[PDB]
Amino acid sequence: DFQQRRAHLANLSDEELQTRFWEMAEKIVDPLLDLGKKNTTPSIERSVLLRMGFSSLEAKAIVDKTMDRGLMGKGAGHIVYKIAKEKNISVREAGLALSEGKYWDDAIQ
Amino acid sequence: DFQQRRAHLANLSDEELQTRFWEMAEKIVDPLLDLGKKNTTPSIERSVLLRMGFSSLEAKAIVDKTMDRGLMGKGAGHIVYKIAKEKNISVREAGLALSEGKYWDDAIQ
Amino acid sequence: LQLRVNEKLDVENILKDLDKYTPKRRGWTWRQPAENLQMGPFIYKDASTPLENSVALPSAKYFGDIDPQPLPVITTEIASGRFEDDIRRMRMAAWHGADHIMVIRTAGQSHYDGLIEGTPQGIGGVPITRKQVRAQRKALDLIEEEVGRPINYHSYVSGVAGPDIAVMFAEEGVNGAHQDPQYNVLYRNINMIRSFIDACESKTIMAWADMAQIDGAHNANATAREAWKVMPELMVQHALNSIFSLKVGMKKSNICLSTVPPTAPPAPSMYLDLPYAVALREMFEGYRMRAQMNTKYMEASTREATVTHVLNLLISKLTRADIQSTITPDEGRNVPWHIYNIEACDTAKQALIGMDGLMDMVQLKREGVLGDTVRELKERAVLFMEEIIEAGGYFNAVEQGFFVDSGYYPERNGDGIARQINGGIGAGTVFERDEDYMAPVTAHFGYNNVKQYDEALVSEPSKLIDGCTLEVPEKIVYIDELDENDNVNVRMEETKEFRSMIKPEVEWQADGTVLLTMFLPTSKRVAEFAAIEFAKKMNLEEVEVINREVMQEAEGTRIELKGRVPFSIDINSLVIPPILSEDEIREDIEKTPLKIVAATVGEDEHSVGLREVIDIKHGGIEKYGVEVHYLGTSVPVEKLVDAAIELKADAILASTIISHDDIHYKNMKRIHELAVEKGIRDKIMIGCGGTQVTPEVAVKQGVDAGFGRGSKGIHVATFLVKKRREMR
Amino acid sequence: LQLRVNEKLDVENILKDLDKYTPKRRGWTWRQPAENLQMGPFIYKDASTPLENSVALPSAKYFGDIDPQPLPVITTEIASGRFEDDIRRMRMAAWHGADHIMVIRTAGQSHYDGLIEGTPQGIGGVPITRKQVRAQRKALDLIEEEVGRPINYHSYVSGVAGPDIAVMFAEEGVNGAHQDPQYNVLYRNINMIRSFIDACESKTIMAWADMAQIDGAHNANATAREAWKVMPELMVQHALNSIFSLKVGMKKSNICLSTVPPTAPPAPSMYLDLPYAVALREMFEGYRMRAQMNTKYMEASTREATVTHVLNLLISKLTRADIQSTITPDEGRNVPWHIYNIEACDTAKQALIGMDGLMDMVQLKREGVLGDTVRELKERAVLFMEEIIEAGGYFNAVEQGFFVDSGYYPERNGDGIARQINGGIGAGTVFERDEDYMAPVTAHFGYNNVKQYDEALVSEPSKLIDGCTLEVPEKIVYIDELDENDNVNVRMEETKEFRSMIKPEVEWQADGTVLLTMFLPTSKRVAEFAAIEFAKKMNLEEVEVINREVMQEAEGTRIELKGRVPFSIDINSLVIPPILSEDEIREDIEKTPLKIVAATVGEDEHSVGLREVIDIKHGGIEKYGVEVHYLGTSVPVEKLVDAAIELKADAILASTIISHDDIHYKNMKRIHELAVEKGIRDKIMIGCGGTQVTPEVAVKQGVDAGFGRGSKGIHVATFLVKKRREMR
Numbered sequence A, B: 001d002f003q004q005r006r007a008h009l010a011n012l013s014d015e016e017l018q019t020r021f022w023e024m025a026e027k028i029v030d031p032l033l034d035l036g037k038k039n040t041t042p043s044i045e046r047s048v049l050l051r052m053g054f055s056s057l058e059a060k061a062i063v064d065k066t067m068d069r070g071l072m073g074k075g076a077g078h079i080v081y082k083i084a085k086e087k088n089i090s091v092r093e094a095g096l097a098l099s100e101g102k103y104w105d106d107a108i109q
Numbered sequence C, D: 001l002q003l004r005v006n007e008k009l010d011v012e013n014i015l016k017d018l019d020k021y022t023p024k025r026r027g028w029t030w031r032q033p034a035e036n037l038q039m040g041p042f043i044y045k046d047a048s049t050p051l052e053n054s055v056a057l058p059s060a061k062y063f064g065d066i067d068p069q070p071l072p073v074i075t076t077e078i079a080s081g082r083f084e085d086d087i088r089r090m091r092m093a094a095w096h097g098a099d100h101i102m103v104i105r106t107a108g109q110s111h112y113d114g115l116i117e118g119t120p121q122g123i124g125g126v127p128i129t130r131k132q133v134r135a136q137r138k139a140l141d142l143i144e145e146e147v148g149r150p151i152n153y154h155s156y157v158s159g160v161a162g163p164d165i166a167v168m169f170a171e172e173g174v175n176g177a178h179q180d181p182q183y184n185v186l187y188r189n190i191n192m193i194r195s196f197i198d199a200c201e202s203k204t205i206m207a208w209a210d211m212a213q214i215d216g217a218h219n220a221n222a223t224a225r226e227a228w229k230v231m232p233e234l235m236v237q238h239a240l241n242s243i244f245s246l247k248v249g250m251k252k253s254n255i256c257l258s259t260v261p262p263t264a265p266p267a268p269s270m271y272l273d274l275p276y277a278v279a280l281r282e283m284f285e286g287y288r289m290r291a292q293m294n295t296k297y298m299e300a301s302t303r304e305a306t307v308t309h310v311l312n313l314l315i316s317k318l319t320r321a322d323i324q325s326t327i328t329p330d331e332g333r334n335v336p337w338h339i340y341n342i343e344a345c346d347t348a349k350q351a352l353i354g355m356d357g358l359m360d361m362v363q364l365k366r367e368g369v370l371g372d373t374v375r376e377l378k379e380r381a382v383l384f385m386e387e388i389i390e391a392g393g394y395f396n397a398v399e400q401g402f403f404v405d406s407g408y409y410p411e412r413n414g415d416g417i418a419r420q421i422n423g424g425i426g427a428g429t430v431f432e433r434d435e436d437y438m439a440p441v442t443a444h445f446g447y448n449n450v451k452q453y454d455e456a457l458v459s460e461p462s463k464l465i466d467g468c469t470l471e472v473p474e475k476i477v478y479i480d481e482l483d484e485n486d487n488v489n490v491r492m493e494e495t496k497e498f499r500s501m502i503k504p505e506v507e508w509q510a511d512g513t514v515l516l517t518m519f520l521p522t523s524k525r526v527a528e529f530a531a532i533e534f535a536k537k538m539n540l541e542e543v544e545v546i547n548r549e550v551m552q553e554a555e556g557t558r559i560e561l562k563g564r565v566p567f568s569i570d571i572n573s574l575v576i577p578p579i580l581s582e583d584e585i586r587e588d589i590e591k592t593p594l595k596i597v598a599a600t601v602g603e604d605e606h607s608v609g610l611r612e613v614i615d616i617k618h619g620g621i622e623k624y625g626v627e628v629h630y631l632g633t634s635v636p637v638e639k640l641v642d643a644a645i646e647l648k649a650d651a652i653l654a655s656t657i658i659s660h661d662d663i664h665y666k667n668m669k670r671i672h673e674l675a676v677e678k679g680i681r682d683k684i685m686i687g688c689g690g691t692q693v694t695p696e697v698a699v700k701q702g703v704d705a706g707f708g709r710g711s712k713g714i715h716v717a718t719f720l721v722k723k724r725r726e727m728r
């Protein structure tokens, strides 16, 4: 088998062969990168919350509640942000509230 | 230093240098081999005796007497051999006796 | 602020005020090259800057105690479950040259769907938390200022909580980490759609933090049935992670392939592994190489491991290693111990320094079977890639079992691991982003609608909140401990006890383990159980046989065992007393020359003992420049003393081997008296030697020094120059 | 008479009837190449013929326990002082590939002016005599038939009694010998005329016996101040013995240069020694290369020793080694122990095999800096010879101290050894041969006037006596013992008991020694002393520290110690009890598939433990081919049971980490109940695991097996295939 299969590659110069290797490597990965552009996961949202000022405990609670309300598509961080602004409160307060059940009806609205 | 010493080798090829090294090695050992051709020692002579069928205790004793009577120059083996013939007895007879003081008169004669 | 080389790490003090600890610096550091570096009498071609403080190789004592450091970053792996003990080992490793400390995580940390907090006890690794990372980074700041050279602190971003860890790591100045979305799928069965989406973010963060990334391809060695068959797959895993990471935006110079030579002796391992190594350095020019050493084909022998490691290092020197990680020689025998991390570091240093400049003298035969085999491996990889696309991509490829298969690609034995696009851990947790999705932080990978709020802030989404934690470290929420009983404070409180009894350890304070090595003249199974009965009778407990090697089936067996010491030693209960060097002795004799007369006395014909301490062959005094007048044997004391006067000597040295009716002491008396009788006695030295001599009893017979069984020329040379020195 | 692989070598029987023993063989044997030899899955390029019986390397088990053997003859050095103990070690060494056994002589044998007889105890070596030679050669004759490849026996011809010894070695089968007339003068101060006149005879006797000759050049390494300055002297000593031996009549192919690479790390040792090695082999084309390992720059770390030995071995591989000698890695620590010879044999073998074929892929960059240095070294050496001639020859050179000078020739520092042409041991024992000088024997070098007795016998002088011992072995005078106290039988009666009780030994029957390695957290001095006390309290006698390594000044120190076990053990008083492989478990499941449902059960969210016995990463049952449906955590017990019926699982594996209120054992009972209740209990295997699970207690709740701390996939997969079998 290896002989039969390699036949097309048998005339490629080392750089034809190396760039081909890499070209295909690239096609194998582009779609995975696309999924990463257009989608999210609870770890990504929790991590976004870490960076916005929240603990692990707090991120879990906000994101768990974000999933319950089918709001992941907006970004848990966005929720915390938009709520902060339409209650004239701090980021740090919106998120703590949210992590405790408050303001979810307002978010859905 | 070294750079001065080596000026006369500088133009030699690798082959001529090897040759020179060995021809000089052989000049150096030639006189040593020569000494070998023309001289004997207590160790060489005990070793001839060992090879003629004598123990090491015997061979020391025969050689220690040969040095004593000044006949190393003939060969301690020689001495044993001659004595055996001239008295018409076995090489070990000759030698056993020689190692305890007998026939040394005859040898000098 | 502090670290004194003669005082231990105040680990307690280290654990204080972690809430206030900020890392000193960010990112990965490489070693600094040092062109044509002179150290002692030598010049080195492949060296980096020497350390300010360090422990040199044992045989460095012959050369001014030089500690040349090679150019590759050197890794050692420290993680026993108790990071607070481990911190002490880190200090040993840095002194022996390690500048990359890798902390393997407590088993299954990949599965924690978020950060954990505090300092629980780990299992086969350390549980990675903010407090623990701070402890160690803080520690390695102190250790690095001391040794004089920055240490890269390193752990793992693997798992379902990759993005969470990448953030924590990035805030706390973790210098390097492993991340490979394929690891998660293949070996942890993390859902593959979630794994690849998470990696985009994890890598984006690591790029921000300028960390070195290591990939997961060493795993394919471990899970291959025959590792010399798995090279096409490795190339593919290396390629896919590599280019993924590049397109995410990570620098080529931070992307490092984790590459372990597949085989070990008795395989012909250089020949099998060398073409793989070249093909890999060629296809992956641009990227970094993290060589790491064999673990697959390894057993309970530290000797055997070490030898294989030097060949591993050779493959690195003959090709290229940006990072050279190490594996401890006991790894396949026991959980690693302090002394074996150190062995590993010294071995890497020793071997690489040994090979300094080698590539100015040796080169690859690039055309020849090398070239053909390299070309073949590259083709096998290319074909692997073509078939992945033909199956419709990466996901389809994994579902059909292309990976972890035992065949030599393109042969497929059909025993791969097939993960399911819809299955695995966190299957069902991917969420589509809406048109109005937004995240207001630095270093987010994906679609981010920032324009809906501020056109201007698109390029710095954090501004919406006046810094996320990558800009404003004060917004980090530090948690101390969540478990009141299972933590570092309770554990350290547990051994305030030892802080001045002492006992052994291998990894944790006072853990009392030691290593027992013996040979036993019998069959191996009998040997094994006989060995335990000796260790018991030496009062060891928890005794385990951990290496058996056969010498010969009948003749006997090597056995190593580890055991526990069930008591301690009061340091202060120890009687501990309060040294001229060969070179010191030699310089002394050049200034003022020393002259000797020597004979084997009486009617004694035994010449050797005296000759042994004179001939240079076995370190006799000829070595140290001494001038010796030897008068043979059966030489009466009279003539020996007359000869010292005659020759105008500094010492008489006589031998007595024959000792019937104490004739050997009776003849020392004489020399001393005879030398007195003639008057030279105070102006000259007299040593005397013999099989049945006692260095005590011979000063008793008048003479100055005595010498028995085992005397060397160092001893008699020592004597001479120290006595001479009492006078002049 | 026999030899059986499971019966110990019978020394006493070996010692019987030595006056009747002849050599089976004479002369030297090289190893036979086995071109392109296949062993297990590999083909070898530089292999030699395999052994019929041997111990393979540890890691050979992963490859069908193959034991490939390399090109060069391999040496080990066995010489404890008691040859009767040393035979047993020889057997071990032979199974481990050693096919040249070298017996270092008792300290100062060179000074014995003639053969010694019997079997007195040596010190630092074996007293070489006809009896001891016949015993070891007889035993080796047996040990070589066992392993299935000839073994070369080797000792030394040095000293005042050269020709006596060469005769005895000739007569008694010795296969190889050291002989250099320079060794005698330079290092033992034996008269130079006596020395060279004896060498002529010696070497002739050695030629006759088709023996391999090893020279004495290595000694110049030991006596160098800086071995990297000593090379031009080395080339010179190698030449003179080599040409001298050539003209005496020795075959080039038997003339072996003793070449040790001069440096060791932290010197740039490859870079320093590689050009010497190349220059030496270029210049001495046609001669044999006896590579030997470094002892000069060595210490008490076995590790350090072993690594430098691999670089030594690399040097050989990059050039040539016809014989490769080995050094035991304990040689700077103790007199070599059994087990450390065996290390050396394994290291030599492992490294060389690991480099099999290496020179098809790598070559010397002979043009460039290497050739420049090769050339320079050669020129330095030619100038050395020039000056010798210019001085008026060898004897003047030596007198003027040309040799053993610390300078880098032609730099001379003035510190050389100077021997007196008139002087030394045996000055004035050279006698002029007369015109009627004669010796009626074969293998005599000098002028022999046999013409005066018979011109026909000139070429066969022993016809004069009807054969010398060289032709008529029958004439050899065998002496058993001269001393009736110090002989082999008194020593043997001392340990007759130990021949059904046992103790450890390092070199001599029941010597009781063992090694203890430990780390102690304190400075090296205290650590040393503490270490002595722990060894005391462990019931060890005669305790010496033999190795100290600083981990770090404060943090701690590695100590190693030897000591004696004062007790013995009866092999009967020992209680010894009377397993499925990975492959076996894999095979069982390939053929009969095996589907499992699993879950962490109840409310429990701790998931890691269960995945850890399942994911393929740390050996979980996935790796064996088990189809695993995972239901997650907090899965109620009934749910897991319904899942098993619906999916037709062969087993339920469940985890239970929280154990508050015996909730672990309880949900065990509720699963068995539910199974019973639903009428599938005897069709299904139930395994339950968790941190506080005690298997015995688990089985008592009705489940088939329980799994606690430290469980692995292999444990779990083993129970599954075992129970299922038992079930049907």
Ligand code: B12
Pocket: C603, C604, C605, C606, C607, C608, C609, C610, C612, C613, C653, C654, C655, C656, C657, C658, C659, C660, C687, C688, C689, C690, C691, C692, C707, C708, C709, C710, C711, C712, C716, D107, D108, D111, D112, D113, D116, D120, D121, D123, D483, D485, D486
């Ligand atoms: C080989 C040997 C001989 C050789 C001589 C060796 C030679 N040419 O040098 C021959 C020649 C074979 C021989 C002959 C005899 N020997 Co003897 N010999 C031995 C033997 C086996 C070896 C000793 C030896 O050389 N050791 C090697 C060296 C390294 O050890 P060392 O000599 O003790 O030297 C070390 C230390 O003592 C110290 N040292 C020694 N001298 C000095 C001097 C100075 C200044 C210093 C600083 C240090 C120092 O440093 C050295 C190295 O660390 C011993 C037995 C034994 N196992 O010890 C007997 C032995 C000593 N000799 C013995 C006897 C009886 C004899 C004979 C009488 C036997 C007979 N034929 O009847 C004859 C007499 C010879 C004579 N005229 O003196 C007995 C002595 C008994 C007694 N106490 O009287 C011994 C002990 C054997 C025995 N145990 O029965 N033997």
Ligand code: B12
Pocket: C107, C108, C111, C112, C113, C116, C120, C121, C123, C483, C486, D603, D604, D605, D606, D607, D608, D609, D610, D612, D613, D653, D654, D655, D656, D657, D658, D659, D660, D687, D688, D689, D690, D691, D692, D707, D708, D709, D710, D711, D712, D716
């Ligand atoms: C990490 C951890 C957690 C994590 C778990 C993350 C995860 N994904 O698993 C989080 C952080 C989630 C956690 C939460 C809690 N935990 Co917790 N946790 C730990 C910890 C430190 C380690 C557990 C672990 O993963 N060990 C490593 C694995 C590999 O070991 P293992 O589980 O023993 O598995 C091995 C064996 O048991 C065996 N095995 C196990 N199961 C099975 C099954 C089968 C079929 C087989 C064949 C073999 C097998 O194989 C494995 C090794 O080979 C332990 C303490 C400890 N040292 O054990 C507690 C601990 C178990 N949890 C504890 C508690 C109290 C909690 C919380 C209640 C705390 C709280 N928040 O109030 C919660 C409860 C959450 C819940 N809903 O259940 C207690 C349990 C107390 C008790 N007496 O029951 C512990 C003991 C800590 C303590 N001493 O207080 N904690």
Ligand SMILES: Cc1ncc(COP(=O)(O)O)c(/C=N/CC[C@H](N)C(=O)O)c1O
Pocket: D077, D105, D106, D107, D108, D109, D110, D111, D156, D157, D158, D159, D178, D179, D180, D183, D188, D215, D216, D218, D219, D258, D292, D325
């Ligand atoms: C040429 C020669 N003759 C005799 C002796 C020793 O033998 P006496 O003590 O009887 O002099 C030595 C020393 N050899 C060290 C061996 C090394 N391990 C080797 O690999 O050769 C020697 O070099």
Ligand SMILES: Cc1ncc(COP(=O)(O)O)c(/C=N\CC[C@H](N)C(=O)O)c1O
Pocket: C077, C104, C105, C106, C107, C108, C109, C110, C111, C156, C158, C178, C179, C180, C183, C188, C215, C216, C218, C219, C258, C292, C325, D617
């Ligand atoms: C990419 C990756 N992630 C995580 C883990 C740890 O695994 P959990 O957290 O899943 O238990 C491993 C495993 N071993 C360490 C690497 C090796 N000691 C090395 O030198 O490379 C891994 O390879």
Ligand SMILES: C[C@H]1O[C@@H](n2cnc3c(N)ncnc32)[C@@H](O)[C@@H]1O
Pocket: C117, C118, C120, C481, C482, C483, C484, C486
């Ligand atoms: C059992 C594991 O669960 C985590 N954990 C999270 N919250 C708590 C809590 N309130 N009490 C105890 N442990 C907790 C860790 O503290 C611990 O290591």
Ligand SMILES: C[C@H]1O[C@@H](n2cnc3c(N)ncnc32)[C@H](O)[C@@H]1O
Pocket: D116, D117, D118, D120, D482, D483, D484, D486
């Ligand atoms: C003491 C040493 O002297 C040598 N020797 C030579 N002859 C005798 C003898 N008759 N008795 C004892 N030893 C003797 C030995 O071979 C011994 O080892």
